[PDB]
């Protein structure tokens, strides 16, 4: 009989039951989407988009609903922290319900197409054999894809007839869904320009419409039909799998580096923002501008938004997690409650000292403090007998500006050292570690988990492309090579051209 | 030598549906007490 | 709700072990010569 890894090949010559199987697969995927959204709604805490946003809570599909304009709940909240909003039907809950209903309708259609598989439509009128005209099917589907692509860009993303898309400022403080005009100049190809996303779907959609019409009206050249085996449905599987792994690598890359379609308020900050001290530089710029305008140190730091400080913290870096450290980021360091304020360290001489921050590479990291020129001035020693830079010897203190601890100063060396240990993570926060029984170990965000799964799937689908492309081009030898294989075709010198019997010497 | 006491075993579709119903309904009944 | 932590595995095995027993018997019935 068929071995277990070939059971689905019974669909190759059965277009109707292939459609049934595709319907069932579509039903399962839509059903997963609906169930996933319901599970997230049953666990999402909407009460704090500042220090407990969706990406701290392990939310995977919620940011995708928000990205395209679904931001509200029937229960009255929105993900930007509003109360008493009316989303209409198209709340998170409505989206979930629609996917569940779609799943059911697709399941019913799958049953029909499985029972009524023997439709005259699927037969070649000449031969009476099962036949799909794949070249013309491609044109039809490409035309439809083009129309939908164009409509998505021209109506939904523009807000002309639709909600728009999520956009934000460069530091992810004031994100919201907005109408976005297309960008038709070279900046449209900037991955961070959302107007380029709008221009893409308008322009690519029109190209898809035109190419679709071409592929409906012009038959493939005989040379290409034979070489790619266009009468064989497995050729379509091969090249479709290739297109899909290309797309999957792309979305993995844009998730990891960031773009207009992977905003940090939905998926969390990127690792490169920690690497380049992106948020620290903006924080420092704002403090210095406050001081330049006459503010005290306490006022300047109290003017820093808690949301901006929270981005400048390594526990939100997606490159700090672990493969088997499961769940939301909140399960590790805890549910963030409040900024403690900016810690300023000083030695007994009164010089300001700076804690060396932990790079993402390091699971653990020493505590070393330098002056403004990078000269080491204090540390936490391992061996004590030859310590020279201990906090006790150097009289290290810490004062806090802004946040909970604003205006306070600590001099007790164990207390100063504890704050220094937190300062290697950047800005210091108070966490609720009890509600979730958090274990104190960093986890990655949806940005990290999305990137991992899609790079892995992309690589595996490369094998799929290789396999089905091989099956397509070598179909004649799938069961083995010719029993009467001419030895002259494989030995050297008989033919001038390899594998060409007409070139015998 | 082959054992002459062997017999084939059967479970028809209706019996499958009846058994699955019994198992699933028993599970729906007893699960609350397993979670307690 | 603070439910018994073994409730999940108990229910899962309660469903799956006898259901799988029946599925085995049904499928090997269908595959016998007709």
């Amino acid at each position: 009989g068929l071995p277990w890894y070939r059971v689905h090949t019974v669909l190759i010559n059965d277009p109707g039951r292939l459609i049934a199987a595709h319907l069932m697969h579509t039903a399962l995927v839509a059903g997963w989407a609906g169930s996933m959204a319901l599970y997230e709604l049953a666990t999402f805490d909407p009460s704090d988009p500042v220090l407990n946003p969706m990406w701290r809570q392990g939310m995977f599909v919620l940011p995708f609903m928000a990205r395209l304009g679904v931001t509200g709940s029937w229960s009255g909240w929105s993900i930007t922290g509003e109360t008493g909003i009316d989303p209409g039907f198209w709340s998170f809950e409505g989206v979930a319900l629609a996917h569940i209903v779609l799943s059911g309708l697709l399941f019913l259609a799958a049953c029909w197409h499985w029972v009524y598989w023997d439709l005259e439509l699927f037969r070649d009128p000449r031969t009476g054999e099962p036949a799909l005209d794949l070249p013309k099917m491609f044109g039809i589907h490409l035309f439809l894809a083009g129309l939908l692509c164009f409509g998505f860009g021209a109506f939904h993303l523009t807000g002309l007839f639709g909600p728009g898309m999520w956009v934000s400022d460069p530091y992810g403080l004031t994100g919201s869904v907005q109408p976005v005009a297309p960008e038709w100049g070279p900046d449209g190809f900037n991955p961070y320009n959302p107007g380029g996303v709008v221009a893409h779907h308008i322009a690519a959609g029109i190209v898809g419409i035109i190419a679709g019409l071409f592929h409906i009206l012009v038959r493939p050249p005989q040379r290409l039909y034979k070489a790619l085996r266009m009468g064989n449905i497995e050729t379509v599987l091969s090249s479709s799998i290739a297109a899909v792994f290309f797309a999957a690598f792309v979305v993995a890359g844009t998730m990891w580096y960031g773009s207009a379609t992977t905003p940090i308020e939905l998926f969390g900050p990127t690792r490169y923002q920690w690497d380049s001290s992106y948020f620290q530089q903006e924080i420092n710029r704002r403090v210095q501008a406050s001081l330049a305008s006459g503010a005290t140190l306490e006022e300047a730091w109290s003017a820093i938004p808690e949301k901006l400080a929270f981005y400048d913290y390594i526990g939100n870096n997606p490159a700090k997690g672990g493969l088997f450290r499961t769940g939301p980021m909140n399960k590790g360091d805890g549910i963030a409650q409040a900024w403690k304020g900016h810690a300023v360290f000083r030695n007994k001489e009164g010089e300001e000292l700076f804690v060396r921050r932990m790079p993402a590479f390091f699971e653990s990291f020493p505590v070393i403090l330098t002056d403004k020129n990078g000269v080491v001035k204090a540390d936490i020693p391992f061996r004590r007998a030859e310590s020279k830079y201990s906090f006790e010897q150097q009289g290290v203190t810490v004062s806090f500006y802004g946040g909970e601890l604003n205006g306070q100063t600590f001099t007790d060396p164990p207390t100063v050292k504890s704050y220094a240990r937190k300062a290697i993570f950047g800005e210091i926060f108070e966490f609720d570690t009890e509600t979730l029984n958090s274990d104190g170990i960093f986890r990655t965000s949806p940005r990290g988990w999305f990137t991992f799964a899609h790079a892995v799937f992309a690589l595996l689908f490369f094998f799929g492309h290789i396999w089905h492309g091989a099956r397509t081009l070598f179909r004649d030898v799938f069961s083995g090579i010719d029993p009467e294989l001419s030895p002259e075709q494989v030995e050297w010198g008989f033919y001038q051209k390899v594998g060409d019997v007409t070139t015998r010497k | 030598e082959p054992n002459p006491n062997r017999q084939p075993v059967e479970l028809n579709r209706t019996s499958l549906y009846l058994g699955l119903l019994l198992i699933l309904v028993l599970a729906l009944l007893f699960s609350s007490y397993f979670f307690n | 709700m603070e439910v018994n932590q073994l409730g999940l595995i108990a229910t899962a095995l309660f469903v799956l072990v006898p259901s799988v027993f029946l599925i085995i018997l049904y499928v090997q019935t269908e595959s016998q010569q007709k």
């Binding site: - | 209706t14 699933l24 979670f35 | -």
Partner: peptide, 30 residues
Amino acid sequence: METITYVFIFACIIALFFFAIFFREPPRIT
């Protein structure tokens, strides 16, 4: 997890109803 378990078993039962009715062994007169 308990709610998921209860709803899962319920959903399996409803699925069984569907197969038991529409994919029954057809009654045949011999």
